[PDB]
Amino acid sequence: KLFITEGYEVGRVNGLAVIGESAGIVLPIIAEVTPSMEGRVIATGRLQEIAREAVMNVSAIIKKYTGRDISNMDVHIQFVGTYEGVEGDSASISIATAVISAIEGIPVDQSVAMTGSLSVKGEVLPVGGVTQKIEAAIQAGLKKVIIPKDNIDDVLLDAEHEGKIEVIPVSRINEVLEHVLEDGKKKNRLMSKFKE
Amino acid sequence: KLFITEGYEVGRVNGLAVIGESAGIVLPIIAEVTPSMEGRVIATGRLQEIAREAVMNVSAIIKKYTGRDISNMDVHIQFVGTYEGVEGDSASISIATAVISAIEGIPVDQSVAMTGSLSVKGEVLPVGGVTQKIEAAIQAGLKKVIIPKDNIDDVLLDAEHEGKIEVIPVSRINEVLEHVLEDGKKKNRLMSKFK
Amino acid sequence: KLFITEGYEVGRVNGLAVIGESAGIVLPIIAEVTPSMEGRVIATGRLQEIAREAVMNVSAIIKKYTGRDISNMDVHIQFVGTYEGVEGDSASISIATAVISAIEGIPVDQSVAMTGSLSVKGEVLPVGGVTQKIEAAIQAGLKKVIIPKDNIDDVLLDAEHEGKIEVIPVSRINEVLEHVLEDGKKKNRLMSKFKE
Amino acid sequence: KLFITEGYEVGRVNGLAVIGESAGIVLPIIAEVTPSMEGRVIATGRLQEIAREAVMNVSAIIKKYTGRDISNMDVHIQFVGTYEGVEGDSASISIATAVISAIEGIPVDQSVAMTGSLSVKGEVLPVGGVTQKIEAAIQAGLKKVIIPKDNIDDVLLDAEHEGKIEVIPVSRINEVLEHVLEDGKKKNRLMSKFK
Amino acid sequence: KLFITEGYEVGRVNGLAVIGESAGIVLPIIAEVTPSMEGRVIATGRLQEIAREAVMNVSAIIKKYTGRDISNMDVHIQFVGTYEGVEGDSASISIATAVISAIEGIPVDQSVAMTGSLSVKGEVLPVGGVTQKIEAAIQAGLKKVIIPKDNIDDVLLDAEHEGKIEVIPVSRINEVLEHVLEDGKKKNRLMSKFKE
Amino acid sequence: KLFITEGYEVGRVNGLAVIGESAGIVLPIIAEVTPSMEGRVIATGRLQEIAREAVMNVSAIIKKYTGRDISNMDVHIQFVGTYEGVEGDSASISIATAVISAIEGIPVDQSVAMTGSLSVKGEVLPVGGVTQKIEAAIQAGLKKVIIPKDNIDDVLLDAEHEGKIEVIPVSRINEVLEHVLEDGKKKNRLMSKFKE
């Protein structure tokens, strides 16, 4: 199977996505980081362009909140499996989440999938095919799905479904991290860094 | 909805644009600026050269009048949502407006969209697709498109678009801010710096 | 309107080009220059390569006859308007002409459109589409049209349209300039500077 | 015939991949190394992003355990054959493996296909298209196939096929190496280095 | 009209090409060199890659046979006019002629048009649509047409059409230059570094 | 036609490609070398990275064997031909062979073609499309086709192709070589260099 459904893992997130117009999918990302040999973002396959765009875009948010500049480190991003036929999210919050995880060595809840794009301001703004994703998620045996707050009323769950996934609307990057990073002294420090 | 339409709000604005044909869409920008360890405009997409340009024109206006150097501070320009076959506007005023809005950190009326092209020396130059653009601001339920002046007569709106919206003829950048940049002490300050 | 058709403005020049396969359009153009403190030609959209070829060529000529070394300047060039399926003359001379005008800061006559491919050496080479361009010129109500002298047998106008525009042709850029540049001290002192 | 099914060769591994939207193919590779007197990774084709990626995850892994650095080496990789319609897997292990084989000088077992994505930490990640990666390797007469353990449930074989190949599930790049590298003094001391 | 049919001009050659595959056309070019003040080939719009290629090949023999390194110069090629539906020769001897011409300032004779491709060892190789081309040469009042020696029997002319143009087959670059460069002291010294 | 087929010229190697689907193209290569006046591999088009690969590999095996180093040469590598959908073998041996030719200044049997991938041990790896290649090599009325050895059995031929040609299998560069160099003193000196 292409993704983990529970446990905690560094630089590892289950985003969600769309195949064709039919349907949604579990889209899992690893991020890993190593210092550069000036610094680039490595990824390949049908999604590399989504990946440099999120990673690059989010990169100031990522400097306000470790203090590691991205151009001092190499960011190794893959998508786990292959997917031709898939639209992914712009500035996707999973790809930023997995990177912050990897930079910070703080693990991620696999049982919580996510969707949204990430304002360079740090907000999370709406994305297509939410119902179709939750749906893929309900199909995956994942437990909670984070989503943007303005897709709140695009969640057209057809009952019996209303109780098999916990749908969590967020609107900051800090809410996404709060809700998926493993508890501990590290995330506690981390969270406290989210302000002005 | 997806794109915001009520409120005021920082380094983010309503670009008008056109997917080629008769074909309007509302294209927001979102800007953000961070004083740097010079600096680099960071933006992605088919419309980076434009993000870059808008920004480059807009530092003359700001080192000159304000006397802020925008070379000291990395700048994020990002357009929103999935846009395909879009023609952008050279030195597009949505961006430069958002850029003044990041940097003097002062919100913008989101009733208001706009389109235009910013000359280094401050002008709002005319642009193609001025009508279909207004038609876009309309089925997106907005209050006021701002629009270049030399574009008035490229409005030729029909009965189902006539009186639906406030069109603002602008010649200068500061006519743009006069009209969208929210109110109080900072705007007032930014204004006088100019003349 | 996307162009001006009377008076003088700095750094502004109504080009001529062809849309699809019949017709002309006026290709209006602005250039502006600030010191760089070397520098670039910033232009965007579809016709950018032409802007850089023309500024690349104007500037050598600038350096030979005046003093001003475009080396030291950012030239910012725009096609007021947005031009798809439109196709220029290489080393377009509207463009070179708008640059020579931002730099000298002598305004240009808007009542006269033009078209020419500019050699590094200073000639105005011939260009495709004269007849049609001159028709578009007639159409926006522009008084004259400056063309490459070798394009003179290409002019195919119905006798009544020969009443409508002046057709001037030319073999060197400095002739485009007496022909366009605002009458003046500056302009004179400038014509002096291309004594050959 | 485009790959080998018997014997050991230095720096040659039988990858596995898909052509169109089913059918596996065996995807064989040489890597080779020479020093760089910096270092570059040399591969053409539709699959070379992958080749560059594979190698760049191997380096750090090798450095961390073996001490050898690859900045001071040029690496030359080839997909023996011509590979259109084909997607490889991210950072294929088969390439990672063929690089380790090169540098260390230890023959690889040609009768064992392998598929997988190597992570920078040395972990073996799951992949698209396992079954036809398996069918195709049977098709070629390979005796074992190494697959990412996390894909054990994707293995879908008819019994007449269950007996025809050995499915070996791994989760780490050192396991792959033990399972493929030729036996001997080199192999062992090499392993003592990943523990 | 777009080419000069007689006299000599620095860096100015009448190549031949084909419009679609109905007909030949004169495709006239100009190369011009300025110093680099790392060096480059500037050129525009439609046959810009034929242009970059031709030069990138001949560089070779620009050094090997004679004088200057073109990585220290900028090569500014233009096609005089505009070029859609036209098909460009590779490693074009008309470019190389133009570029050798501009560097030596030895004028090229405009009553002789040319087609063919330059190998890097400097044989001229067959090209396509030669009859059509010559038919363009003929049509356009150029006196003489240089063509590749392996196309000799691909020339299929009507009676009337054969005396209408001198046809000159060549097998090597130095013959093309023997043929089109202004006699005089400078060509003599150029031509005599085209040994062994 | 545009290519060689009996004969013995230097720097030139009739290789083999597929135009995409499976349609035999002879793809002639011209190599050329001069000294840097460090050095460079000077190629044009889609194949231009193959070239530098074929080159790269060949310098390695030359430095080793002959002792000669050719980091000093400026290498020119040319594709004779005009087709798109062009599809080349990695480290393609044609190029490897035109080059070794170039350098050792040694004429090639024009009457022979080849496909092949060359490794840094100067093995001949097999390549796909073996049968289409043997065909354009027939259509091109050539006498011999060198193929990689392990390609030995992707060889078919309906009645119409069988015994139309000396197909010749190889596993090493020095075979490729023994096959195609013009006999005598410099073949010889350079040959045994691969043995010493």
PDB file of C-alpha atoms in Angstrom, chain C residues 81-194:
ATOM      1  CA  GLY C  81      -1.587  46.758 -25.298  1.00  0.00           C
ATOM      2  CA  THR C  82      -1.432  42.971 -25.243  1.00  0.00           C
ATOM      3  CA  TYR C  83      -0.422  41.395 -28.577  1.00  0.00           C
ATOM      4  CA  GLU C  84      -1.242  37.824 -29.570  1.00  0.00           C
ATOM      5  CA  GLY C  85      -0.670  36.464 -33.028  1.00  0.00           C
ATOM      6  CA  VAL C  86       0.920  39.826 -33.704  1.00  0.00           C
ATOM      7  CA  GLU C  87       4.361  39.716 -35.264  1.00  0.00           C
ATOM      8  CA  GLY C  88       6.876  42.523 -35.333  1.00  0.00           C
ATOM      9  CA  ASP C  89       9.742  43.607 -37.473  1.00  0.00           C
ATOM     10  CA  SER C  90      12.942  42.411 -35.891  1.00  0.00           C
ATOM     11  CA  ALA C  91      15.144  45.167 -34.452  1.00  0.00           C
ATOM     12  CA  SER C  92      12.075  47.216 -34.562  1.00  0.00           C
ATOM     13  CA  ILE C  93      12.753  50.919 -34.832  1.00  0.00           C
ATOM     14  CA  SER C  94       9.741  52.180 -33.033  1.00  0.00           C
ATOM     15  CA  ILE C  95      11.554  50.510 -30.141  1.00  0.00           C
ATOM     16  CA  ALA C  96      15.111  51.814 -30.648  1.00  0.00           C
ATOM     17  CA  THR C  97      13.370  55.206 -31.343  1.00  0.00           C
ATOM     18  CA  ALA C  98      11.472  55.230 -27.879  1.00  0.00           C
ATOM     19  CA  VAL C  99      14.741  54.315 -26.064  1.00  0.00           C
ATOM     20  CA  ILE C 100      16.733  57.083 -27.835  1.00  0.00           C
ATOM     21  CA  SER C 101      13.907  59.344 -26.670  1.00  0.00           C
ATOM     22  CA  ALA C 102      13.757  58.221 -22.887  1.00  0.00           C
ATOM     23  CA  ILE C 103      17.563  58.737 -22.631  1.00  0.00           C
ATOM     24  CA  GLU C 104      17.665  62.223 -24.409  1.00  0.00           C
ATOM     25  CA  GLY C 105      14.331  63.085 -22.788  1.00  0.00           C
ATOM     26  CA  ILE C 106      13.110  64.750 -25.979  1.00  0.00           C
ATOM     27  CA  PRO C 107       9.445  63.918 -26.663  1.00  0.00           C
ATOM     28  CA  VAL C 108       8.300  62.123 -29.889  1.00  0.00           C
ATOM     29  CA  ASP C 109       5.462  63.041 -32.312  1.00  0.00           C
ATOM     30  CA  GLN C 110       2.496  60.720 -31.766  1.00  0.00           C
ATOM     31  CA  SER C 111       0.849  61.729 -35.066  1.00  0.00           C
ATOM     32  CA  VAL C 112       3.447  59.753 -36.991  1.00  0.00           C
ATOM     33  CA  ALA C 113       3.729  55.989 -36.922  1.00  0.00           C
ATOM     34  CA  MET C 114       6.689  54.015 -38.237  1.00  0.00           C
ATOM     35  CA  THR C 115       8.320  50.659 -39.049  1.00  0.00           C
ATOM     36  CA  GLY C 116      11.878  49.485 -39.829  1.00  0.00           C
ATOM     37  CA  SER C 117      14.368  46.925 -38.803  1.00  0.00           C
ATOM     38  CA  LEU C 118      17.457  48.645 -37.340  1.00  0.00           C
ATOM     39  CA  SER C 119      20.954  47.484 -38.145  1.00  0.00           C
ATOM     40  CA  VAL C 120      23.679  47.797 -35.520  1.00  0.00           C
ATOM     41  CA  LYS C 121      25.284  49.997 -38.120  1.00  0.00           C
ATOM     42  CA  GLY C 122      22.357  52.396 -38.222  1.00  0.00           C
ATOM     43  CA  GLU C 123      20.277  51.721 -41.314  1.00  0.00           C
ATOM     44  CA  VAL C 124      16.655  51.196 -41.583  1.00  0.00           C
ATOM     45  CA  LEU C 125      16.201  47.800 -43.250  1.00  0.00           C
ATOM     46  CA  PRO C 126      12.856  46.842 -45.053  1.00  0.00           C
ATOM     47  CA  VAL C 127      10.111  44.942 -43.286  1.00  0.00           C
ATOM     48  CA  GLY C 128       7.089  42.762 -44.393  1.00  0.00           C
ATOM     49  CA  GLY C 129       3.500  44.185 -44.452  1.00  0.00           C
ATOM     50  CA  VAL C 130       3.926  47.833 -45.414  1.00  0.00           C
ATOM     51  CA  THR C 131       0.615  48.246 -47.364  1.00  0.00           C
ATOM     52  CA  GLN C 132      -1.425  46.737 -44.583  1.00  0.00           C
ATOM     53  CA  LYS C 133       0.437  48.594 -41.902  1.00  0.00           C
ATOM     54  CA  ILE C 134      -0.153  51.851 -43.716  1.00  0.00           C
ATOM     55  CA  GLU C 135      -3.855  50.941 -43.925  1.00  0.00           C
ATOM     56  CA  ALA C 136      -4.003  50.487 -40.056  1.00  0.00           C
ATOM     57  CA  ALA C 137      -2.118  53.809 -39.957  1.00  0.00           C
ATOM     58  CA  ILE C 138      -4.783  55.486 -42.136  1.00  0.00           C
ATOM     59  CA  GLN C 139      -7.273  53.791 -39.774  1.00  0.00           C
ATOM     60  CA  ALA C 140      -6.252  55.212 -36.358  1.00  0.00           C
ATOM     61  CA  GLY C 141      -6.041  58.613 -38.032  1.00  0.00           C
ATOM     62  CA  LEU C 142      -2.217  58.984 -37.750  1.00  0.00           C
ATOM     63  CA  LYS C 143      -0.814  61.845 -40.077  1.00  0.00           C
ATOM     64  CA  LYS C 144       2.391  60.225 -41.316  1.00  0.00           C
ATOM     65  CA  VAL C 145       4.214  57.006 -41.713  1.00  0.00           C
ATOM     66  CA  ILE C 146       7.900  56.590 -41.789  1.00  0.00           C
ATOM     67  CA  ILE C 147       9.042  53.487 -43.547  1.00  0.00           C
ATOM     68  CA  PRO C 148      12.167  51.863 -44.724  1.00  0.00           C
ATOM     69  CA  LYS C 149      13.153  53.474 -48.010  1.00  0.00           C
ATOM     70  CA  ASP C 150      13.526  50.071 -49.788  1.00  0.00           C
ATOM     71  CA  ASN C 151       9.885  49.343 -48.902  1.00  0.00           C
ATOM     72  CA  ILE C 152       8.780  52.112 -51.318  1.00  0.00           C
ATOM     73  CA  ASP C 153       7.703  49.755 -54.183  1.00  0.00           C
ATOM     74  CA  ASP C 154       5.599  47.748 -51.536  1.00  0.00           C
ATOM     75  CA  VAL C 155       3.216  50.689 -50.922  1.00  0.00           C
ATOM     76  CA  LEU C 156      -0.010  49.632 -52.681  1.00  0.00           C
ATOM     77  CA  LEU C 157      -2.566  52.330 -51.986  1.00  0.00           C
ATOM     78  CA  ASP C 158      -5.861  53.194 -53.738  1.00  0.00           C
ATOM     79  CA  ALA C 159      -5.429  56.787 -55.005  1.00  0.00           C
ATOM     80  CA  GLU C 160      -7.855  58.189 -52.379  1.00  0.00           C
ATOM     81  CA  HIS C 161      -5.659  56.653 -49.612  1.00  0.00           C
ATOM     82  CA  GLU C 162      -2.669  58.309 -51.087  1.00  0.00           C
ATOM     83  CA  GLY C 163      -4.494  61.498 -50.028  1.00  0.00           C
ATOM     84  CA  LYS C 164      -4.791  60.246 -46.486  1.00  0.00           C
ATOM     85  CA  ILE C 165      -1.336  59.675 -45.079  1.00  0.00           C
ATOM     86  CA  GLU C 166       2.139  60.953 -45.597  1.00  0.00           C
ATOM     87  CA  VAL C 167       4.596  58.293 -46.464  1.00  0.00           C
ATOM     88  CA  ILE C 168       8.166  59.202 -45.792  1.00  0.00           C
ATOM     89  CA  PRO C 169      10.808  56.888 -46.280  1.00  0.00           C
ATOM     90  CA  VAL C 170      14.185  56.668 -44.745  1.00  0.00           C
ATOM     91  CA  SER C 171      17.563  54.885 -44.791  1.00  0.00           C
ATOM     92  CA  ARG C 172      19.220  55.837 -41.382  1.00  0.00           C
ATOM     93  CA  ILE C 173      17.872  56.101 -37.693  1.00  0.00           C
ATOM     94  CA  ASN C 174      18.926  59.799 -37.393  1.00  0.00           C
ATOM     95  CA  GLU C 175      16.521  60.592 -40.198  1.00  0.00           C
ATOM     96  CA  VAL C 176      13.735  58.919 -38.057  1.00  0.00           C
ATOM     97  CA  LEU C 177      14.785  61.268 -35.441  1.00  0.00           C
ATOM     98  CA  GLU C 178      14.393  64.839 -37.247  1.00  0.00           C
ATOM     99  CA  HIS C 179      11.370  63.254 -38.527  1.00  0.00           C
ATOM    100  CA  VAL C 180       9.980  62.368 -35.021  1.00  0.00           C
ATOM    101  CA  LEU C 181      11.744  64.144 -32.108  1.00  0.00           C
ATOM    102  CA  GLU C 182      10.222  67.440 -30.723  1.00  0.00           C
ATOM    103  CA  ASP C 183      11.781  70.584 -32.492  1.00  0.00           C
ATOM    104  CA  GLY C 184      14.245  72.186 -29.887  1.00  0.00           C
ATOM    105  CA  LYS C 185      17.701  72.927 -28.409  1.00  0.00           C
ATOM    106  CA  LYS C 186      18.041  69.261 -27.308  1.00  0.00           C
ATOM    107  CA  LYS C 187      16.897  67.860 -30.610  1.00  0.00           C
ATOM    108  CA  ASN C 188      19.418  70.128 -32.486  1.00  0.00           C
ATOM    109  CA  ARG C 189      22.328  69.451 -30.308  1.00  0.00           C
ATOM    110  CA  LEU C 190      21.329  65.827 -30.852  1.00  0.00           C
ATOM    111  CA  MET C 191      21.087  65.912 -34.720  1.00  0.00           C
ATOM    112  CA  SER C 192      24.599  67.513 -34.563  1.00  0.00           C
ATOM    113  CA  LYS C 193      25.777  64.397 -32.732  1.00  0.00           C
ATOM    114  CA  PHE C 194      25.070  62.021 -35.639  1.00  0.00           C
TER     115      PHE C 194
END
